[PDB]
Ligand binder design. Structure first.
Ligand code: HEM
Ligand code: HEM
Ligand code: HEM
Ligand code: HEM
Lengths: 141, 146, 141, 146
């Protein structure tokens, strides 16, 4: 469960991301594809090279989904219900892969927001991304 | 584990700039804070009640320094990690019974600390090279379970 | 999330366990200690040998907790809140260990209830135990 | 992986009684049903819409038979699983890119199927011996990632 301090920490850290939201999402995806090449197979219709407009566009989508989760942090299953159906049913994304993207998002935030990435905020962000991941994997049937 | 020359270059170049007195403690402290069940193995370290207490704890910084030394040692023997980590594998597996998933977690926390310290210098390809390294170290430390 | 069919399947399978509830819990613990020896370290004040009264007694406690979860399957976080605090805060149980006990409980059920352990019921039981595990690991702070 | 003689005895004795035409299909079918994301790798197998469809699917039974053969082959070479599974490691890792966590899952499903078929004969010590085996096989199949 996310504590009051966790929600405060996540909202504050995500507030600092700003207009870089989509850019950071694209960078996390890139980090994931290079570090964990098994994840590339979900994106055959994507060119996954550096500077790919497709990865850029998709990063924005990811970031917008996370922003929705932050904005509705007390109601995340409802907010993310459609995306949960997509990832589990249609796409059949292996649950292990959410841990990989979550790690790459943390690394991206650490690399761009040094002042915000305190140990306490790191913990809060990890819990938040784990909560998002739990919702997105909740619909395998 | 096999790194390309470009990856070896990326890894060794960054590691030379690492503050070896601090980075280890920062990674171990963050492990204890972010994954609090790991505190079970460090009850003799004293005050771990708050994040500030953990990061300022002299024993955490001291022990973190030893961890980092082991990673440094691994970076020098990427082609023989199993032999390099044999004694540490017996310690963490046979004596301590640490679940090996936690070796992976500490490795990933180290990667976060390197990103924090190096910023844009910690590029996605540099990260990918360091992920190969910490995976190799975790697998070698877990050998006594295999 | 647990579907209507999942809840039906779990209730029916657990109904067949009956007075063997505590016995099967003890057997799952034994299977866990032998198969995954890292888990033994949580129980130093226990004699973990075969026929141990302590493992028998603890198996009953485990089974009673699972029975509570089955009986309150739509309200599990509330029902298991006290046990979540215990395992995460006080005991600091590694989350990986819940997957190990869950597997040993499935093996125990498979070995004792061959008619009930259909592929569909296996799936439902796995989802149920994963849901219980999610609640019991929800309180790390 | 190292089994005691008692464990080797337990494992080999039970394996002799295994129905090699069916158990493999039962384990693969249950993998597809219990962990539905694994169906991503088997779209050419046809009808996987229901548990009944999966378990009765001729391609699932056929492929499961090949899986089980590989486990049997591993049981004959417990002291050299890496060499035994080299070609299969290249297939599942380099060509298929299956996450190795799924090797562990299939192993555990096999253990459930053995429990189902053998009942009280699948004692906790026999299980513990089979857990060592399926861990060894999973680690060997994942070697190309290491
Ligand atoms: C924090 C975790 C994640 C978030 C917030 C997220 C969010 C999204 C969003 C917003 C979309 C587009 C939905 C739409 O356009 O209708 C999407 C699509 C997709 N996601 Fe994710 N996702 C996450 C994790 C993952 C992971 C771990 C994988 C696989 C490794 C993955 C694979 C895909 C694929 C393959 C698509 C469809 C791409 C396409 O066909 O254009 N996602 N995701
Ligand atoms: C890549 C992962 C790891 C590395 C490289 C590593 C390295 C080390 C080193 C160098 C020592 C000092 C040994 C000595 O004094 O000779 C040590 C001790 C210790 N480690 Fe770690 N370690 C790792 C993961 C872990 C984790 C994840 C835990 C627990 C969650 C852990 C628990 C301990 C404990 C309790 C000791 C003290 C043992 C004693 O003094 O008797 N280690 N480790
Ligand atoms: C389905 C999962 C689990 C259930 C339902 C469960 C249930 C319980 C219950 C009912 C108790 C006793 C509570 C009390 O007496 O106040 C307990 C205690 C305990 N549990 Fe679990 N548990 C689960 C998983 C685990 C796991 C995976 C571990 C560690 C490997 C673990 C370690 C312990 C320990 C060490 C105690 C205290 C024993 C003592 O001091 O007497 N539990 N659990
Ligand atoms: C211990 C675990 C496993 C063993 C022992 C195993 C064994 C095998 C064997 C013997 C084959 C036949 C290769 C041949 O025709 O020469 C095969 C093929 C295949 N395996 Fe597995 N396997 C395992 C895990 C998995 C998992 C978990 C997945 C996916 C979730 C998977 C996906 C596939 C696919 C798609 C093929 C067909 C490849 C082709 O025909 O081109 N395997 N495996």
């Amino acid at each position: 469960v996310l504590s009051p301090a966790d929600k405060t920490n996540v909202k504050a850290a995500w507030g600092k991301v700003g207009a870089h939201a989509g850019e950071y999402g694209a960078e996390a995806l890139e980090r994931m594809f290079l570090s964990f090449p098994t994840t590339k197979t979900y994106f055959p219709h994507f060119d996954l090279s550096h500077g790919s407009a497709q990865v850029k566009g998709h990063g924005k989508k990811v970031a917008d989904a996370l922003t929705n989760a932050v904005a509705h942090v007390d109601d995340m299953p409802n907010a993310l219900s459609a995306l949960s159906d997509l990832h589990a049913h249609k796409l059949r994304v292996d649950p292990v892969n959410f841990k990989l993207l979550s790690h790459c998002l943390l690394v991206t935030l650490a690399a761009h927001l040094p002042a915000e990435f305190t140990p306490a905020v790191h913990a809060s962000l990890d819990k938040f991304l784990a909560s998002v991941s739990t919702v997105l994997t909740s619909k395998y049937r | 584990v096999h790194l390309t020359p470009k990856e070896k270059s990326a890894v060794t170049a960054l590691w030379g700039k690492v503050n070896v007195d601090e980075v280890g403690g920062e990674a171990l402290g963050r492990l204890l804070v972010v994954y609090p069940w790991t505190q079970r193995f460090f009850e003799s370290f004293g005050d771990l009640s708050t994040p500030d207490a953990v990061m300022g704890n002299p024993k955490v910084k001291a022990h973190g320094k030893k961890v980092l030394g082991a990673f440094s040692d691994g970076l020098a023997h990427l082609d023989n990690l199993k032999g390099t980590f044999a004694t540490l594998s017996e310690l963490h597996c046979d004596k301590l019974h640490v679940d090996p998933e936690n070796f992976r977690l500490l490795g990933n926390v180290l990667v976060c600390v390197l990103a924090h310290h190096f910023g844009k210098e910690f590029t996605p390809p540099v990260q990918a090279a360091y992920q190969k390294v910490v995976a190799g170290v975790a697998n070698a430390l877990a050998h006594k379970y295999h």
